[PDB]
């Protein structure tokens, strides 16, 4: 029932994510010279560093709101891709099956510590 445990735990999340090999074309915001039609395609651009520094920063006030920013570096790569072959789209596919099996008990144990704190 600790209302503030979820962000130490997003923390070590975030740390296995960037030790994994295929989190690299997503640690830091899309290269714009190496892409130049990204911004035609995708409106909110999103990456782990900029998760990790909200974070980090105090601008997250519960970890949907950290898991809403996570799923959008997933939906961007799935927007841009040219093709559901591609091995940056491939990559992204597993990364995001991670995140989901490691992010679902920190959300449900963030929603029952809130709902003690109301009873
Ligand atoms: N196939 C790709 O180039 C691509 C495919 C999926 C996501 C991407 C991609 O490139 C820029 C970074 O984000």
Redesign the pocket.
């Known amino acids: 029932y600790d209302i503030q445990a979820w962000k130490k735990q997003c923390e070590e999340l975030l740390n296995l994510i960037f030790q994994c090999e295929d989190s690299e074309?997503?640690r830091q915001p899309?290269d714009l010279l190496?892409?130049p039609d990204?911004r035609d395609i995708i409106d909110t651009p999103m990456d782990f560093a900029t998760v990790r520094e909200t974070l980090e920063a105090g601008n997250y006030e519960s970890p949907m709101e950290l898991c809403k920013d996570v799923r959008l570096i997933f939906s961007?790569?799935?927007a841009?891709?040219?093709?559901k072959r591609?091995?940056?789209?491939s990559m992204?596919l597993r990364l995001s099956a991670f995140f989901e099996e490691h992010i679902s008990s920190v959300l449900s144990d963030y929603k029952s510590a809130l709902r003690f704190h109301k009873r």
């Open positions: 074309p997503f899309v190496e892409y990204y961007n790569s799935k841009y891709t040219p093709s591609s091995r940056i789209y992204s």
